[model samples]
Target: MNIFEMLRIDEGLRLKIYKDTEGYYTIGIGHLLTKSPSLNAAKSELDKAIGRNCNGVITKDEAEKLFNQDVDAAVRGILRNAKLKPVYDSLDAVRRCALINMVFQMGETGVAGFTNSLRMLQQKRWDEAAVNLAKSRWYNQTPNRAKRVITTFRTGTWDAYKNL
Candidate 1:
């Protein structure tokens, strides 16, 4: 599976509002409504998309669309960062997927805070990069997911992430 497919499996599709592990109102494959610009805007857009009052439920199709939107935005945000662009461009497909996955969950700003890791990636120091990733709050919060992504960085292959 590619990055989006991997993320879909990792995030899991959800049709209703649910509090995430972080205690924020989230929906639709990890879309954080609490982090949205405004509750009114999110509610209105969801209502329009679902063709009624949102009632915390969204269709699978809408959820997928939102996921793509969020992923694309994350990609664009990563590319737009002057510091990250060169490092992102330097990576191969599998490692790039790992980078995008990190950005998708943490936002480009958060990923950018990993200056040492990014530098390690830029230098193609795979083990060092993975070690940098492992020593983080993100790794503590989601150990399995972070382990898989770190493995991707370490090995630069999908071999560690078989069966989705």
Candidate 2:
């Protein structure tokens, strides 16, 4: 099935547009986001909301087809605005993928909030980077979810929760 079908957009699990209490259009997955418009749009807006571009939700097929397109565009916007790229260009595949997952959850700007953490990663500080990874609003707010992602990031292996 296509992504929209897999996500069950017609079953109240996902939707193209949502109306807020104020009757505004929002896009999101399941019912978590109250303001996103589409999957790509949600990912873009989420990049703004959190401060970095993330992969958001992509199937392996979708990732192969569309991985860096919009993320590259969003990063350019971030570079123009912040005069820096928060992403690590030299990271290995797994590390980069982990960062993408974090960015997807946090966004470009939100990820930038990890001032010390980003510096640690840039300096090749793995332990520090892991520590910083666990010390974010995202982490504190979602401990179980954060633990799962961080574990996958550190170990480079898949877990059930991290499969999504």
Candidate 3:
């Protein structure tokens, strides 16, 4: 199967989740498989993981690298579940991907550090959420990306990606 087919994902964002262990999986943003395993079960698990989901368009090499980062970040995020609910509850897939990208860029603790943004999101205050999302070190560091993501969250357009 092609990467898109294998991942069961679309074109805008290309992220993949792989099983690291039983009942645990890792996500990759711009990369694919990391280490090669011997067991069929492991291979099967990898295949299953590869078939999870992707957030945007990417190359195989990029997928592999993103996989490494995404997996690590996903693990940290899961471990810190208590802090993620607010962001988790408020975001749609694209918005969530934006948040994931942000979290990946910033560590889990860094993303979770945004107490006001999380609260604003959970309250469904779109304007406040957008404002809060923009009021971050990340926003200051990457204004272009932040604007795009915040716009997506505010308008739910995701650059015109819609289901009919």
Candidate 4:
């Protein structure tokens, strides 16, 4: 399955602004908009990305475009990460996508914090890696998504989660 297709399900699409679990302004399938110093700046950036007065709204195509842009940046960041690159290279397609999905939600720095997990993944210790992930606050915060991603990493297949 395409990575973005899996992520679309995991992240969910929204045409209007909404608060995330962390109460940050988010839109368009978890595209975070509060990174700017101010709300107005963030809104303005959103407007520029979607090409109009956002009026607290975005289009489906706009969301897709933004999602692709975010995904590309996440993938590139993972590829360039000195510590993550080798582990990512050692992984299969399913686990590779899982890694990208983790970075998509947590950012490269946050994922990089999982030193033990990364080492386990590098050693092909799938169960150990999953266990390490399951022990995190992230797992508790988003148990459902984390379960699927961890399972994907452990099994090296998308068969179970592709339809879900």
Candidate 5:
């Protein structure tokens, strides 16, 4: 099955223009996005993929293709941030993924605003970093997700993860 086949049920494809959970412009199955054809560019891309003109929307197939590209970019972007800090690369995959998710959820600039937490992370103080994360505005905004991310950082184990 294609990625969409696997993920669309959760992503929830919308045949019309929409915004994501975080309010970013999105359309077609969880294609969490940033820009478009001045809202015009989408038409041609979708037409070529499925002959379903993007009059104001893209097909599920087009959305899948779009997110494939989008997810890759997000991963690379996070990898850079992880590697840029001397201590971050020391983390195992799970913690690294948590950091990436943190950046993705909050935006790089927003994550950067966690000055104390970043400092603890830079020093490889996982426990302190996690504690500080719990104290942040981001944590206040999304407690459950923040809790999960911090648990990953703190323990490097899936014990606290409800999904794992």
Candidate 6:
């Protein structure tokens, strides 16, 4: 993945944040995230988002490392949930990557639920799969993202991949 671009597009460069997917406190570029910490502790730990324990500011290079680590971890997770590994592996790189982005956004289980779309992919109908995605509830919730992922399939453009 082109790591820096994903950050700018994914989270839009937030300098300070106090919570995560499960409502836990996290810091810059999705760092210091955990559900167990006391609210005050989490707030205090914002400084830890950067390497220093005392700075809120972080360099682009530093943020790139952090975001890449996060994206790489997310990719590993998407791979580990391998119920569709063969199907995933059979695809061309752009298509494979598109699905990986799909799984990351919707999670393995969530993406797996798109039975019609899955069937389209399994049958090697790339455009049809993209169409199904556009028709999916997932699309309704996040149009730009859905468009991007599906466009990677429909248009065969890896540049559209915004997978984190």
- At residue 22, candidate 5 shows an lDDT of 57
lDDT of 1: 0.84
Point out the worst 10-residue segment of candidate 3 by lDDT. 2-11
The parts of candidate 1 lying over 4 Å away from their true place are: 35-52
Candidate 2's C-alpha runs over 4 A off are 1-13, 16-87, 157-164
CA lDDT of every candidate: 0.84, 0.50, 0.55, 0.89, 0.61, 0.64
Clashing pairs in 5: 13-29, 37-40, 37-41
TM-score winner between candidates 2 and 3 = 3
Candidates 4 and 5: which is better by TM-score?
A: 4
- Per-candidate TM-score against the hidden true structure: 0.89, 0.51, 0.53, 0.93, 0.64, 0.66
Candidate 4 lDDT tens digits, 1-164 = 87998899899999988778877778998999885446677687688778899887888999999999999999999999998899899988888999999999999999999999999999999888899889999999999999999999999999657567
Candidate 5 lDDT over 131-158, as tens digits, reads 8788876788667667767887888765
Question: Better model by lDDT, 5 or 6?
Answer: 6
- How far does residue 124 in candidate 1 sit from its true spot (Å)? 0.6
TM-score of 6: 0.66
RMSD of 4: 1.7
In terms of lDDT, the poorest run of 10 residues in model 5 is 1-10
What is the alpha-carbon lDDT for the whole of candidate 3?
0.55
Positional deviation of 38 in candidate 5, in angstroms? 11
Which digits, one per residue and each the tens of the lDDT, describe model 6 over residues 4-120? Answer: 354446445555555655466655565544566676565455455455664444566666677777667656765676556656766776677677666545557887677787777
| Tens-digit per-residue lDDT, 1-164, candidate 2 | 22232222221222233453334333343223434445566556545544545455333333322334434544454455341254456555555545555554456677667777767666666776777788666777667657765665565455523345
Please report how far candidate 3 places residue 114 from its true position, in Å. Answer: 0.7
Clashes of each: 0, 15, 19, 0, 3, 0
Alpha-carbon RMSD, each predicted model: 2.6, 9.6, 10.5, 1.7, 5.2, 4.6
Candidate 2 has what TM-score?
0.51
